[PDB]
Design a protein around this ligand. Structure first.
Ligand code: FNR
Ligand code: SF4
Ligand code: FES
Ligand code: CL
Ligand code: NA
Ligand code: NA
Ligand code: NA
Ligand code: NA
Ligand code: NA
Ligand code: NA
Ligand code: NA
Lengths: 155, 417
């Protein structure tokens, strides 16, 4: 397994960015998941080599940080907050609307591999509860009609 | 400069300091920042010795805004007693439920924070600084990177800043989903490229931190006060608000209020005033049942007339205000808090690892109505035994809010028994 050059360039830049290269491990993992739609298990050995780290160190890191996913590939991660404030203001309405539209529950990926719903802890936007992200973009949920419009932006 | 979409968090201020620009929901770039006299505090600071700055920040009485309330002056003074090199770290992890205040400074007034970092770094003789921002704040990340380049182009960063002889680079690091990486030692650990496991203390970061070197970790908001201190002077600054807790305070208000948002107010403000006078009262004008102080504390409706200070009978915490009204099920709410600590324990200490999990697992059974008597007795026991042997604050507080709900709302828990 070798990365495409395109991806390798970006990884190298993160590694050169910090004073020590191992400090770039999280930026590298973000970049990989962004590029593949997940962290391929086979990516970790060649990443460890670039970071000058042992594999088992990288495995432990991927395991510790909940943003990273090694199981399911998805083009768009719909992160839905399930913490206290969003719960009060209508997480359950958001999840139902997602189920009505996409036909999937938290932890599931649509059959086309397009969208995965990912339950997350507080996203630090509690005043705009209930909150969700679609990859990097972040929104308050107002209604099913409004959610349907937002999701239509991601092709 | 297109950034990811962000919701427009409402912001209001009576002091017009930290929220001077950030009350408007947009990126204030360097030209606009310079037009408000931005970076002039930095210019002033560079004509003072590092020691003078440490003194000014000390005499200001500025306390850390990250939760612990530690005096910033003394902290800086401790780090400079130990030989260099020294590192400065901006804590932008903000992952505690109900807290969404640091992001608005980052996303709207990044130059305020950067100016603070530069002054602070020069004060402790740090030639490298880090912003550690959580990974669920991607816009803040991208905004900070661009702001740093802007400041670099204008000569506020790099080597020999404005002929001063001071060198500084600010590196921006991203998290990847771990509340615990807001704890200062676990942040440094993450910054070193490892899992976010808190270190036994002592030693403290100011002695041994990043790469075992003197390290100051300060919260975004603590840092953002520094330009104001340099600009106004320590004597003027200390007279802002009550004398015990001087300076502007930011209160994130969420839940069942009409005007949820970030409010910049003095700390002599009341809980009742936050909710009704500023946050516009409750939704539907329902009666307030409880206020969750983030994931830390639970106050009842009989406790709204208390100051928002770190006084004995004060609100304390980080002034986080989540409002619950009369129809809200608080054992359902308590479960949500349990579920947070379950997902965030790092696992190093056994009572925390096992207690955070069991607290949530058992409370879910209670909520669903499938708990046995042994599950009830065991929930109680687990709740009072998360703390022992714990080496960081999370273990010490994982059962606090829930315990207070049992004590302050017994009638509501009896319903589930
Ligand atoms: C579990 C947990 C989580 C956090 C913290 C503590 C603990 C125990 N702390 C406090 C942090 O360790 C430290 O006290 C402050 O960052 C120091 O900065 P100030 O002196 O407050 O400016 C903390 N601080 C902060 O700036 N942002 C955060 O998100 C958190 N999160
Ligand atoms: S108390 Fe909990 S969160 Fe803190 S170090 Fe121990 S196991 Fe980790
Ligand atoms: S509780 Fe959902 S964003 Fe804070
Ligand atoms: Cl602490
Ligand atoms: Na977020
Ligand atoms: Na913006
Ligand atoms: Na601007
Ligand atoms: Na202006
Ligand atoms: Na914002
Ligand atoms: Na984090
Ligand atoms: Na986590």
């Amino acid at each position: 397994f070798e990365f495409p050059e395109e991806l390798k360039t970006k990884l190298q830049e993160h590694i050169n960015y910090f004073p020590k290269k191992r400090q770039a491990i999280l930026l590298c993992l973000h970049e990989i998941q962004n590029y593949y739609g997940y962290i391929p298990p086979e990516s970790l050995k060649p990443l460890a080599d670039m970071l000058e780290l042992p594999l088992n160190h990288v495995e432990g890191v991927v395991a510790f940080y909940d943003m990273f996913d090694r199981e399911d590939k998805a083009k768009y991660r719909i992160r839905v907050c399930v913490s206290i404030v969003c719960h009060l203001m209508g997480t359950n309405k958001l999840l139902k609307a997602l189920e009505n539209i996409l036909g999937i529950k938290p932890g599931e990926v649509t059959p086309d591999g397009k969208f995965k719903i990912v339950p997350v802890q507080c996203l630090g936007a509690c005043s705009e509860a209930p909150v969700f992200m679609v990859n990097d973009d972040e929104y308050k949920f107002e209604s099913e009609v409004q959610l349907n419009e937002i999701l239509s932006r991601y092709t | 400069r297109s950034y990811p979409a962000i919701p427009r968090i409402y912001a209001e201020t009576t002091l017009n300091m930290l929220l001077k620009r950030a009350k408007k929901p947009r990126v204030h770039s360097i030209d606009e920042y310079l037009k408000d006299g931005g970076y002039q505090a930095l210019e002033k600071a560079l004509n003072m010795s590092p020691e003078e700055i440490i003194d000014w920040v000390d005499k200001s009485t500025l306390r850390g805004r990250g939760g612990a309330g530690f005096p910033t002056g003394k902290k800086w003074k401790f780090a400079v007693q130990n030989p260099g090199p020294r590192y400065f770290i901006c804590n932008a992890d903000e992952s505690e439920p109900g807290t969404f205040k640091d992001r608005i400074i980052i996303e709207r007034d990044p130059h305020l924070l950067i100016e603070g970092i530069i002054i602070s770094s020069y004060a402790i003789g740090a030639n490298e600084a880090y912003i550690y921002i959580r990974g669920e704040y991607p816009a803040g990340y991208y905004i900070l990177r661009d702001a740093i380049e802007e400041a670099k182009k204008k000569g506020f960063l790099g080597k020999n800043i404005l002929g001063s002889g001071f060198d500084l680079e600010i590196y921006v690091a991203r998290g990847a989903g771990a509340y615990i990486c807001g704890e200062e030692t676990a942040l440094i650990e993450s910054l070193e490229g490892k899992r976010g496991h808190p270190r036994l203390k002592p030693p403290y970061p100011v002695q041994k931190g990043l790469w075992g070197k003197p390290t100051v970790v300060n919260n975004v908001k603590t840092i953002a006060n520094v330009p104001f201190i340099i600009s106004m002077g320590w004597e003027e600054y200390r007279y802002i608000g009550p004398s015990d807790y001087a300076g502007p305070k930011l209160f994130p208000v969420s839940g069942k209020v009409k005007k949820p948002g970030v409010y910049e107010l003095p700390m002599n403000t009341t809980l009742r005033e936050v909710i009704f006078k500023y946050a516009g009262g409750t939704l539907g004008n329902k009666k307030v049942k409880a206020v969750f102080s983030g994931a830390l504390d639970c106050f009842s409706s009989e406790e709204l007339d208390i100051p928002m200070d770190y006084s004995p009978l004060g609100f304390g915490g980080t002034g986080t205000v989540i409002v619950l009204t009369e129809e809200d099920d608080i054992v359902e709410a308590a479960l949500k808090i349990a579920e947070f600590y379950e997902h965030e324990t790092c696992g190093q200490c056994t009572p925390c690892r096992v207690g955070c999990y069991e607290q949530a697992n058992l409370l879910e059974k209670i909520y669903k109505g499938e708990a046995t008597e042994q599950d009830w007795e065991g929930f109680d026991f687990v709740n009072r035994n998360i703390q022992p042997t714990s080496i960081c604050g999370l273990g010490a507080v994982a059962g606090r809010l829930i315990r207070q709900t049992l004590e302050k709302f017994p009638e509501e828990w009896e319903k589930y028994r």
